[PDB]
Design a protein around this motif. Sequence first.
Motif, PDB file in Angstrom:
ATOM      1  N   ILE A 115       0.904  -1.085   0.089  1.00 13.41           N
ATOM      2  CA  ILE A 115       0.179  -0.026  -0.025  1.00 13.41           C
ATOM      3  C   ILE A 115       0.803   1.313   0.002  1.00 13.41           C
ATOM      4  O   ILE A 115       2.064   1.376   0.842  1.00 13.41           O
ATOM      5  CB  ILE A 115      -0.920  -0.055   1.046  1.00 13.41           C
ATOM      6  CG1 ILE A 115      -1.734   1.286   1.230  1.00 13.41           C
ATOM      7  CG2 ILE A 115      -0.200  -0.299   2.370  1.00 13.41           C
ATOM      8  CD1 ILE A 115      -2.786   1.358   2.223  1.00 13.41           C
ATOM      9  N   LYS A 116       0.590   2.259  -1.066  1.00 14.12           N
ATOM     10  CA  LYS A 116       1.530   3.306  -1.128  1.00 14.12           C
ATOM     11  C   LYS A 116       0.877   4.658  -0.547  1.00 14.12           C
ATOM     12  O   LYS A 116       0.327   5.169  -1.310  1.00 14.12           O
ATOM     13  CB  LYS A 116       1.849   3.353  -2.665  1.00 14.12           C
ATOM     14  CG  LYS A 116       2.763   2.570  -3.273  1.00 14.12           C
ATOM     15  CD  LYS A 116       2.481   1.116  -3.305  1.00 14.12           C
ATOM     16  CE  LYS A 116       1.264   0.872  -4.520  1.00 14.12           C
ATOM     17  NZ  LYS A 116       0.942  -0.713  -4.545  1.00 14.12           N
ATOM     18  N   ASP A 117       1.012   4.700   0.820  1.00 16.97           N
ATOM     19  CA  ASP A 117       0.717   5.663   1.492  1.00 16.97           C
ATOM     20  C   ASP A 117       1.753   6.370   2.358  1.00 16.97           C
ATOM     21  O   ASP A 117       1.609   6.550   3.686  1.00 16.97           O
ATOM     22  CB  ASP A 117      -0.456   5.348   2.408  1.00 16.97           C
ATOM     23  CG  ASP A 117      -0.591   4.224   2.971  1.00 16.97           C
ATOM     24  OD1 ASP A 117       0.320   3.298   2.451  1.00 16.97           O
ATOM     25  OD2 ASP A 117      -1.105   4.013   3.912  1.00 16.97           O
ATOM     26  N   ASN A 128       3.228  11.471  -1.459  1.00 17.62           N
ATOM     27  CA  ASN A 128       2.780  10.783  -2.749  1.00 17.62           C
ATOM     28  C   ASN A 128       3.914  10.719  -3.987  1.00 17.62           C
ATOM     29  O   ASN A 128       4.816  11.384  -3.909  1.00 17.62           O
ATOM     30  CB  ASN A 128       1.476  11.659  -3.504  1.00 17.62           C
ATOM     31  CG  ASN A 128       0.262  11.126  -2.646  1.00 17.62           C
ATOM     32  OD1 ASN A 128      -0.388  10.091  -2.413  1.00 17.62           O
ATOM     33  ND2 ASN A 128      -0.480  12.284  -2.361  1.00 17.62           N
ATOM     34  N   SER A 165       3.391   7.890  -6.891  1.00 16.79           N
ATOM     35  CA  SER A 165       2.463   7.848  -7.621  1.00 16.79           C
ATOM     36  C   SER A 165       3.004   7.451  -9.230  1.00 16.79           C
ATOM     37  O   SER A 165       2.301   7.213 -10.072  1.00 16.79           O
ATOM     38  CB  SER A 165       1.523   9.086  -7.757  1.00 16.79           C
ATOM     39  OG  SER A 165       0.917   9.432  -6.638  1.00 16.79           O
TER      40      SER A 165
END
Lengths: 116, 1050
Positions: free
Chosen positions: B724-726, B731, B733
């Motif tokens: 999970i890219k948080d 960010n 992206s």
Amino acid sequence: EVQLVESGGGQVETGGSLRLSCQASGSTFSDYVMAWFRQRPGKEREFVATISRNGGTTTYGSSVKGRFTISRDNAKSTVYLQMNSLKPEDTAVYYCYAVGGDGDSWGQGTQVTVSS
Amino acid sequence: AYTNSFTRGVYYPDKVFRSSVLHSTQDLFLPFFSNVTWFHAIHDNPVLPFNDGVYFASTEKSNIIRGWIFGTTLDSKTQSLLIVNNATNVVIKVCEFQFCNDPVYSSANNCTFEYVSQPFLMDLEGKQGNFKNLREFVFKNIDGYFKIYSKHTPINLVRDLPQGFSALEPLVDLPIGINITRFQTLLATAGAAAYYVGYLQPRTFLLKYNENGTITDAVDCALDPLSETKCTLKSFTVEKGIYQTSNFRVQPTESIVRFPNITNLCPFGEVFNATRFASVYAWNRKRISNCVADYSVLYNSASFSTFKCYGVSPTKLNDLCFTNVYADSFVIRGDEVRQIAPGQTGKIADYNYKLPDDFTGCVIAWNSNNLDSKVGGNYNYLYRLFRKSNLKPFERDISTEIYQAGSTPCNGVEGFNCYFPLQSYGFQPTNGVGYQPYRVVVLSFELLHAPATVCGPKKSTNLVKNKCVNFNFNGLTGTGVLTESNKKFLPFQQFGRDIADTTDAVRDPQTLEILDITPCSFGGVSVITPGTNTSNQVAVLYQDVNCTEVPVAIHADQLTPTWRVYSTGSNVFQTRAGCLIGAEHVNNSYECDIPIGAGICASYQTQTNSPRRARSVASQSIIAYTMSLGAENSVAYSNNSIAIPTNFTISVTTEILPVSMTKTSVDCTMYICGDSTECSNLLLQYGSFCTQLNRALTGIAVEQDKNTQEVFAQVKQIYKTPPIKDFGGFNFSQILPDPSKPSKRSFIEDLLFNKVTLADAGFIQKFNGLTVLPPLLTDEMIAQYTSALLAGTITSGWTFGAGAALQIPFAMQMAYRFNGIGVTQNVLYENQKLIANQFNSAIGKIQDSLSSTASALGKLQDVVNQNAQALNTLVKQLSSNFGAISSVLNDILSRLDKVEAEVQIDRLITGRLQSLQTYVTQQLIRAAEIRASANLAATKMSECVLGQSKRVDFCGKGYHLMSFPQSAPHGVVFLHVTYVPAQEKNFTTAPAICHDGKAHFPREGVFVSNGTHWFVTQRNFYEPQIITTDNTFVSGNCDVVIGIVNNTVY
């Protein structure tokens, strides 16, 4: 200073003798070979005689040759041509022709007249 | 009127449906911007000469145009040609029709060729679409191959020839063999349709293409200069750049202000003018001091009745510095002039002065029966015929040879006794040919010894001082200037070189005779073009020119009339690097751009002076000002005042570095021999180079394997990005690989491996001897490595280059990067959202550039192009005959018999061998510098990414915080964070405060003052706190320094 001044020549009556001199005034004379030349009026010039470099050989003309007498002197640096045994066939202006260095060497041209 | 052939002249010399790669071709090409002769009305169209090339293009409203007729006389007298359109089928007639001044079948005669095909097309391209049609034709004769091109190119601007482009591919041909000179237009006329006529040239295009086998690019050579970026610069869509163009370069400049005005003398005249010279026997012998004659004035003198030269043409006058010259003077017979030749045959030629079997530069003679021959006849010269020592050459035998043996009957003493070699010669002034005394000498030269510098005693930089003829017919094929020289001299004559064969001139005792080489007019060509894309205006630089001297081949004008080619512009300027023919020189001094030289650049804005002004400088011209990086931004003296930052800025870039070849080995034998018994045995016989070269190539192969491995094995074990890219509000992206999209590259990296010009020199490409062994780490393996890279960079810490990757956040990773750069992690724990916004928004907009900015990655593309040119110049060098009848192998193996075939193939191989060794040595230089590049790439990745090095101007400009790696086909992209404070506001400080008789200084901070109070803050962040004894120290007493003041501490 090697300019050949010819001399000795002049009026000579038939049967006489004349001493000839020619100088490269202020420069050498000795080992230049001497070769005079007669030029006849109204005719073609003719070989007479010459000398060797060493002085030992007085290589005269082709025909009877004992007429003309030649020598070099170091002490005064001019020719001593003792002309002798005249014939009227030598009235001419002659050429020093010190063939060493510059061969056809001249610059005055001395005239001997074989008078009567 | 005269209209340019802006894009007209480009076509297909032969069958090439090429695609997007760079290649050249050398044939009969129409010049670009070539002025075209209009014939719209009678006021139909006057006949024109073929000029070994002509152009045509029709701009018709409706179908009117008929054909043409080609031929020498266009009459039944000479073999001609006809072109007719039937609106049903085209025919070509090589026929001899009676010449009608006005046309179409006057008299059918001797019709050797016939042909039928579809008619050449026409109208409704002229009417139906409410536009009109431009129907370009290309007419060429090379080896009789009547090279006919056409297509349609509809346009709406009928005012003149507009811009826009189309290809040109062949239609039909005949094997004629005609000698084409003149041509006529036929149509079955005050206001007839408008067309063009453009005369072609035998030139050398380079051809670039789209992906559909259509033309896109070619350039000009000594015309257009705008669309002459060259005749080979690969693109209509050139950028603003100085482009060297052609080898007709320039004429001189001005110089520094020294000036000669000094002539010397020496008495050479006696050598030739001593009116009492020596006899032919006693050839007088002088050599003389530094004194010469302008042997040009000896060449062009009629005083010499015989100007005969054995070895040097008398038109080679200036560069004659000859080591030894022996003057040998002598009289001649009237008929011996021919007999004057080295190694002759005859009496005098080898029996009074022999020139041996070698050349004798010049032997100069003239009749002088006036200064020598007298009325009684000049009477003082001789000739030795054939009775002497046979006279080895260069011998002045002054000896009196009375005898040769003294006894032999031949000459000796018997028979001939009074014979004597000294036979005298006489003549008269008026005698006639046969005995006319010509003044004759011998001029013999030596060679191979003349190191010096005083074959130049010279000076006087000028424009020019004399007529156009023979300034300097040296610097072979010649050109130059003439003026006067300035120095003294010594006993050598006739020879020297300025330095080491820089032969200059032969100096005067009377004459002018200067070079210091007076010019070969010079080297320089630097045409300016801003690009056909956003401009159509041109100028030209001429490096190192006096602009008053019409730089190229002064007013050559033997070409098409063109304001730039025909140099007459008053809109000029004089730089250090010569004239600027298309200039408007100004002193505005903006930032540098397309450069000229010494500080001259260009590329202003579109409204400098006028509405007609364009983005390209000075429409219809090109203005080139004085270069400047801009202006000053001076910084001032702060004694203790602190212009302290409260804010900061960042930007992101692109860093581009190749990391390999397009991995290539070369089987050296197969490259060269091509699995051939001839060359296989021949190379087995020849040397061991190929083995060493193949070793080097395998070394470079495993080398790029090692480069890929080192750039992509900095970590031992791979780290996938977090699921999970948080990341703490930061960010990304775009740089993490695709979670499940094909090829799993980053969104950025998808856009890169696709946006790379997927031709990429088209190089999907093995032909012969070549190979491409694919790398160790596959493209997806590089991608996975980038995954490991980001995993460590934003997921593990300072430490994925420090062994095993940890499971740690980036919010606090950036907290520790703030913590370890000298400003506390208050910055993000205050502004983690704000710094995250700046950081990610900037990184996003940067990809907008990397998507829009094509060719901004020109270094990886450049190296792909350099390997492309490597293999391409390689194959074209394979297409270099190098001493055989042709560059092919098998034909000349079979064309010639055993010995000739083997020796010619030997030459072919040896040459191509040498070419490959040169290629591989250049490739090893490239390989060493690209090894440096690969080490540098691995080094950037390691230092800047794997941890955080202290390196400055290695990964960004200054404050280095961390860094980011990327990927590419054979190179890599790089982007790394660049931190810079801003918002300077002045505040007073002091090295010491007096309080209780002790000196007070801080640990990490400075005694900042806001005008009346004093605080302690940091030097990239202005944080006000009271000065106390918990965050500072006190010691000693107030020392000697400027700035001791009040406001003690708490």
